Amino acid sequence: HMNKDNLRSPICCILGHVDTGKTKLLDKIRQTNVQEGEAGGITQQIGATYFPVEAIKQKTAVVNKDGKFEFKVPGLLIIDTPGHESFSNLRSRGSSLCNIAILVVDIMHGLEPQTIESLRLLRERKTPFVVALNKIDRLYGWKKIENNGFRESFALQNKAVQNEFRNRLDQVKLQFAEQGFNSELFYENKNFARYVSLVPTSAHTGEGIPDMLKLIVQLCQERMASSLMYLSELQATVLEVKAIEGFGVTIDVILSNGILREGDRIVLCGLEGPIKTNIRALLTPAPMRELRIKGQYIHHKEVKAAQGVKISAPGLEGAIAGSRLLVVGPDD
Numbered sequence: 001h002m003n004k005d006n007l008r009s010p011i012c013c014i015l016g017h018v019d020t021g022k023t024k025l026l027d028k029i030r031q032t033n034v035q036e037g038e039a040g041g042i043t044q045q046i047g048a049t050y051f052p053v054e055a056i057k058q059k060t061a062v063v064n065k066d067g068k069f070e071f072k073v074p075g076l077l078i079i080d081t082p083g084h085e086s087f088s089n090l091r092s093r094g095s096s097l098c099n100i101a102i103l104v105v106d107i108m109h110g111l112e113p114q115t116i117e118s119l120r121l122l123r124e125r126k127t128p129f130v131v132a133l134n135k136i137d138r139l140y141g142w143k144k145i146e147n148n149g150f151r152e153s154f155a156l157q158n159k160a161v162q163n164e165f166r167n168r169l170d171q172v173k174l175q176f177a178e179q180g181f182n183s184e185l186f187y188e189n190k191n192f193a194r195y196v197s198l199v200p201t202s203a204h205t206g207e208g209i210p211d212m213l214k215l216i217v218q219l220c221q222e223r224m225a226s227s228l229m230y231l232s233e234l235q236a237t238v239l240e241v242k243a244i245e246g247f248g249v250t251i252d253v254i255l256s257n258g259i260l261r262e263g264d265r266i267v268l269c270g271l272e273g274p275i276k277t278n279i280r281a282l283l284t285p286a287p288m289r290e291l292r293i294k295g296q297y298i299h300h301k302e303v304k305a306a307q308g309v310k311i312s313a314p315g316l317e318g319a320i321a322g323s324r325l326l327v328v329g330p331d332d
Ligand SMILES: Nc1nc2c(ncn2[C@@H]2O[C@H](COP(=O)(O)OP(=O)(O)OP(O)(O)=S)[C@@H](O)[C@H]2O)c(=O)[nH]1
Pocket: 016, 017, 018, 019, 020, 021, 022, 023, 024, 025, 035, 041, 042, 043, 081, 082, 083, 084, 134, 135, 136, 137, 138, 201, 202, 203, 204, 205
């Protein structure tokens, strides 16, 4: 139950209007270049990256120099989603999977239609979230300290930069208020339960990202339901069905809760009806790497939620994306 083994890694979504820098932020954290790789210059699928709590500590050290801050989660599974208006469905699915979220707003553009759509998803599903005010490097005469906490860098800026920041921030708060949300700059926020925290960030310079990370950890630990900190009954969802060399037809699955084990008899839904099979191989990508991206896999005898995993099993042809996955126990 509330044991410290059986701890669960929560799920965080990233949602936002097109080209606001979701994938870019993820690339900056991962130290990867998925964004350049994307065909057509757009994100068209749900992406999963697992972040061990160690990496989060290391990346939040600058805003946690004293070391006061307490990390209770073992890790965090982070879900990239499409921003283009066409993919409402995938945003809906991703949102359906997450426990908490990051809503990315381009500080230069403010709230845009898919920002509003995402806001409806978050509000309707009562998902705790913070807002990343991205692309602060686009403030006129912004001067950069790489991977710095926002407040430290902001203190260094000239008064013109600070003025323009406060203008754009004020406009964004007005916009959120028009959408029925009270929002606050994160260190100015006194009602964490009811007011949305705003984190200024740059995906290019990495500034404000430590603040964002420590804030999503905070979301997990103080706004998310406490039971979700621990593993309960198994829940898993199929993201994708693809043919992989030497593994045949495989499925990309989000393990939301519970534990998946090699040899588990599983059932999922195909076009015609149910598919019953056995997990032959339980795979994850390397930590800090996309499940979608092709790389050599790490084989597991078991995997604990929440994680993005690739399952190799016979007879997965016809599996449907978005279908839940169940484990069948030996006795009837
Ligand atoms: N100057 C600046 N440019 C950025 C920043 N973040 C992203 N960009 C740029 O904006 C463009 C969009 O980045 P991208 O990561 O594809 O956004 P996205 O939100 O994932 O886009 P999509 O999934 O809705 S198609 C890229 O060209 C990227 O270089 C930032 O913090 N500063």
